[PDB]
Amino acid sequence: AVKIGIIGGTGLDDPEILEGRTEKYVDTPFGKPSDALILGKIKNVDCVLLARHGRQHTIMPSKVNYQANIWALKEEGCTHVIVTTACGSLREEIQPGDIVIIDQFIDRTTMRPQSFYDGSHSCARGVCHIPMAEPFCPKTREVLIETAKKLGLRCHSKGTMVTIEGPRFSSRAESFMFRTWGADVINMTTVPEVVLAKEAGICYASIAMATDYDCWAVSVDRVLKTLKENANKAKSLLLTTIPQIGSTEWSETLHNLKNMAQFSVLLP
Amino acid sequence: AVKIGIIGGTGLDDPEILEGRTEKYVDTPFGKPSDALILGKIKNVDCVLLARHGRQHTIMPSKVNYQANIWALKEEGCTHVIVTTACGSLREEIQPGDIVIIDQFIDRTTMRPQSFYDGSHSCARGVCHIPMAEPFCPKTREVLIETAKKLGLRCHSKGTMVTIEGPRFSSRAESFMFRTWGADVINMTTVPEVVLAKEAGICYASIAMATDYDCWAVSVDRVLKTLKENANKAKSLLLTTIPQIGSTEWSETLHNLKNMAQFSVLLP
Amino acid sequence: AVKIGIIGGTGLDDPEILEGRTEKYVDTPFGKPSDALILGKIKNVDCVLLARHGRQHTIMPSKVNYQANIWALKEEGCTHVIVTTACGSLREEIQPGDIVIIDQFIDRTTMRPQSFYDGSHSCARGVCHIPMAEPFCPKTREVLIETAKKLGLRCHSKGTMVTIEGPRFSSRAESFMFRTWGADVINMTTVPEVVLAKEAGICYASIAMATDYDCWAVSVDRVLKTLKENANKAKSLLLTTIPQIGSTEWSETLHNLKNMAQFSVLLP
Ligand SMILES: Nc1ncnc2[nH]cnc12
Ligand SMILES: Nc1ncnc2[nH]cnc12
Ligand SMILES: Nc1ncnc2[nH]cnc12
């Protein structure tokens, strides 16, 4: 049995995607999640939706409680966590409106807790050095890619996301530099969300939606406009992907993830 | 009517530049500014001078209250903010003593608040994603460049400033790396000063004075020596530039800046 | 007379290396050191050993009190501080088990105090801008290199260490990027340890032990395994190097270090 946690980004957190909805506020050892958890289903698969920035988008990327969000979904019994996020394109071929099933990231954040094992919580004892060679679940990404193809959507099979601290957008010099580093898209929320999901032994995948070409220009109005015009794509992709995830066996994949997380912890 | 805020850097914060001076200590929602505001004039133009590190230079770059400084100048009615800063040269052609009217930056800071919209101040509500494609005012930079030419000063028309966290200087490996990234000069204070000025809808420009070639070596004594030998240049440039700024119309430029800042804010 | 401070890293902090041991808990203006100081000798040379992560390895890299550790050793009268650290190799020629006498670093840390002069301690007044062109002591590194040769150990004479914040390991995209930046090895503790030692006017050198090839894959178990298999190398190197350090004159080298540190401080 699988359970899909869904974290919705800016303008990509529609509750109506779930059938048989029930609101549920929870608490965690790391604090309160961005907003209430929305329990429901897509066909016969159980899901838990959560708005990353709150339903009214009042939380900036740097202040999102990534620890509480991931811990809450883990506590609900989620086996997978598929998220949505807007991003700027750093490559001509990645056009606004395109979907990118990212497989790598480059961290440019500075003031964000990236581990549950901070030495101050009894629920997470020891020092954890989680491997990040392959940050996103290959199997989950594969289903997303094939479903996008079945839907006939413009979708890139891989891509490197550079996550900046924000809330400001990048300068032109920074934008050029990121391209030379090998970054393909840019956002403000992938890190540490992907890191914490790995520590939790959860299958994590991200649906990145290009909304602009950054400035190599971007603005909040441009981002919001493109999201409004393309939100249906992420919704259709999730609706079609999830029942497919639920029809396959994940015990082995989840076992390997649990082992990796478990053996990354150094106890006294 | 224009009003020029002037933020003086290390050894480039001479109060005598202003005529008819009056000291004024102020407070802001973000705390106290580095020191008192010095009100005065250059010809018929009103100005407000502020020492970035305090008159006795007791504040390190990472602890400067950039938010309070910019907010105080904005509250005084400043339409422009022209600053001075020492920097290391990362290019052979930029010689110590040279002035660089920088047009871009690369952020290497880590523990600095970069927005007024942090969710804890009623004076700045919402999430702000300010555009940084063109961080510095083109029109203000243009006047500085032409005035430098009229004065016959060695001045570079553009340049990318990499702002490091400090207080330590860069290692040789870091110095080499910054050159490959496309950085031309290096300092410790441009970011987030330039970011906050943009959020405030103020025309911001920076007079960077090269004092050394970093280590691709630099020392505090070398920096102080070069500043003492060349401080008169920044003073003469400001004295000649400001009356020129005051003789032109800025309502349209300021309107466009206000619009950009206003529409960068996401309200609940 | 010399006194060698030794900071032992993960699995490279064996107390038995010292003869005539005596445990000593101390306090500093910056807080408590990672663990108690172990006083003792190697031949006729006085030494002070300190486990970076605590004897039971309960402190993550980002939470190590680098300020207290360096201050404690300085207060004990240490003239030199030679440390050990595990690291990942970013170059084919640097094989796991190899020693690298690093000479440069690239900072990728974000939430770490890098100076004693933070404006809140009477023991360290003013603003300090310490030079980092040559972060490690050349003379100390030279003795380590020659001793490694006399022992017939695979040892690299130089290398650039990129210090990441951690506790997570790097992503593959980050690993590739670090190689293009010119990094040779990667760890989580060199910065700011090397910076604070310089401010303290102490001769600092690092014995980096490659334990894996990062992911250009690494895991805690792989790291621990390689350290267990090669720990004897660092121990033998220290035992043979230290008596050699004690047989030479260091007054001039220490005087030059004291001058550099002293003149890096800007007083009110
Ligand atoms: N260009 C951009 N930079 C950062 N985050 C973004 N989100 C959407 N577009 C973005
Ligand atoms: N080389 C340098 N690095 C950083 N800040 C500086 N200010 C002056 N020279 C500098
Ligand atoms: N690959 C690696 N990255 C960071 N720290 C390490 N310590 C040992 N191997 C490492």
Q: Give the whole-angstrom CA distance, residue C118 versus residue C120.
A: 6
Report CA(A208)–ligand 2 centroid distance (Å): 39
Question: Which residues have C-beta within 8 Å of that of residue A138, sequence separation ≥ 6?
Answer: none
The two structure tokens encoding residue B242? 């400001």
Ramachandran assignment for C119, one of left (phi > 0), alpha (psi -120 to 50 degrees), beta (any other) = left
CB distance A211 to ligand 1 below 6 Å:
yes
Helix count and strand count (H, E) for chain A: 6, 13
How many angstroms separate the first and last alpha carbons of chain C?
Answer: 35
Q: Give the whole-angstrom CA distance, residue B56 versus residue C267.
A: 8
Report CA(B214)–ligand 2 centroid distance (Å): 6
CA C164 to ligand 3: nearest atom? 4
Cβ A131–C173 below 8 Å, yes or no? no
Cβ A220–B263 below 8 Å, yes or no? yes
Which contiguous run of DSSP H or E holds residue A230? helix A220-245
Q: Give the whole-angstrom CA distance, residue B194 versus residue B201.
A: 11
Distance (Å) of CA C21 to CA C39, C42, C47: 6, 10, 10
Question: Which residues have C-beta within 8 Å of that of residue C146, sequence separation ≥ 6?
Answer: none
- Residues of chain A contacting C169 with CB distance shorter than 8 Å: 129-133
Give the nearest partner residue to B60 out of C109, C111, C119, using CB atoms: C119
Q: Give the whole-angstrom CA distance, residue A37 versus residue A19.
A: 14
CATH architecture of A1-268: 3-Layer(aba) Sandwich (3.40)
Cβ A171–B135 below 8 Å, yes or no? yes
- The values of phi and psi at residue A186, to 5°, are -135, 135
**A204: closest CA among A187, A190, A185, A184?**
A190
List of E strands, chain C: 3-8, 19-24, 37-42, 45-51, 80-89, 99-100, 104-108, 127-128, 155-156, 160-164, 185-187, 203-212, 265-266
Distance (Å) of CA C136 to CA C82, C107, C201, C207: 10, 15, 11, 11
The helix/strand/coil state of B24 is strand
Q: DSSP 3-state helix, strand, coil percentages of chain C (rounded to 5)?
A: 30, 25, 40
Q: Which residues of B touch C (CB under 8 A)?
A: 53, 56-60, 63, 110-111, 165-177, 180, 215, 217-221, 223
Give chain B's largest Cα–Cα span: 53
Peptide bond into A167 cis (omega under 30): yes
Distance (Å) of CA B134 to CA A175, B146, B196, B250, B257: 12, 20, 14, 18, 11
Q: Give the whole-angstrom CA distance, residue B35 versus residue B33.
A: 5
Sequential DSSP letters for B207-246: EEEEEE-TT----HHHHHHHHHHHHHHHHHHHHHHHHHHT
Give the nearest partner residue to A176 out of B109, B128, B182, using CB atoms: B182
CA B215 to ligand 2: nearest atom? 1
The two structure tokens encoding residue A30? 């790391």
User: Is A14 one of the catalytic residues?
Assistant: no
By what technique were these coordinates determined?
X-ray
Ramachandran assignment for B182, one of left (phi > 0), alpha (psi -120 to 50 degrees), beta (any other) = left
Helix count and strand count (H, E) for chain B: 6, 13
Q: Give the whole-angstrom CA distance, residue C229 versus residue C235.
A: 12
CA B188 to ligand 2: nearest atom? 5
Pairing of strands C19-24, C37-42: antiparallel
Which one-letter DSSP state was computed for residue B76?
Answer: T
Q: What's the reported resolution, in angstroms, to a tenth? A: 1.7
Q: Give the whole-angstrom CA distance, residue B246 versus residue B242.
A: 6
Report CA(C188)–ligand 3 centroid distance (Å): 7
Are the beta carbons of C114 and C238 closer than 8 angstroms? no
The two structure tokens encoding residue A146? 């094939």
Sequential DSSP letters for B107-121: EE--S----S-SSS-
CB distance A223 to ligand 1 below 6 Å:
yes
The two structure tokens encoding residue B212? 């050394």
CB distance C86 to ligand 3 below 6 Å:
yes
Are the beta carbons of B88 and B214 closer than 8 angstroms? yes
**A132: closest CA among C72, C237, B199, C174?**
C174
Report CA(B178)–ligand 2 centroid distance (Å): 13
Query: How far from the centroid of its chain's Cα atoms is residue B138's Cα?
Result: 14
Q: Give the whole-angstrom CA distance, residue B149 versus residue B138.
A: 17
- Measured over the CA atoms of residue B192, residue B58, residue B11 and residue B243, the dihedral's sign is positive
- The β-bridge partners of B99 are B155, B209
The two structure tokens encoding residue B20? 């008819």
Q: Give the whole-angstrom CA distance, residue B52 versus residue B58.
A: 10
Question: Which residues have C-beta within 8 Å of that of residue C190, sequence separation ≥ 6?
Answer: C85, C102, C105, C161, C163, C206
Q: Give the whole-angstrom CA distance, residue A27 versus residue B265.
A: 29
Give chain A's largest Cα–Cα span: 53
Peptide bond into B15 cis (omega under 30): no
Sequential DSSP letters for A79-137: SEEEEEEEEEE-STTS-TT-EE---EEEEE--S----S-SSS-TTS-SEE---BSS-S-
Are the beta carbons of C85 and C42 closer than 8 angstroms? no
- The values of phi and psi at residue B257, to 5°, are -70, -40
Are the beta carbons of A237 and A151 closer than 8 angstroms? yes
Which one-letter DSSP state was computed for residue B31?
Answer: B
For residue C31, give the amino acid letter.
G
Q: How many residues does chain C have?
A: 268
Are the beta carbons of C11 and C224 closer than 8 angstroms? yes
Please tell me the distance in Å from A118's CA to the nearest CA on chain B.
Answer: 19
Q: How many residues does chain B have?
A: 268
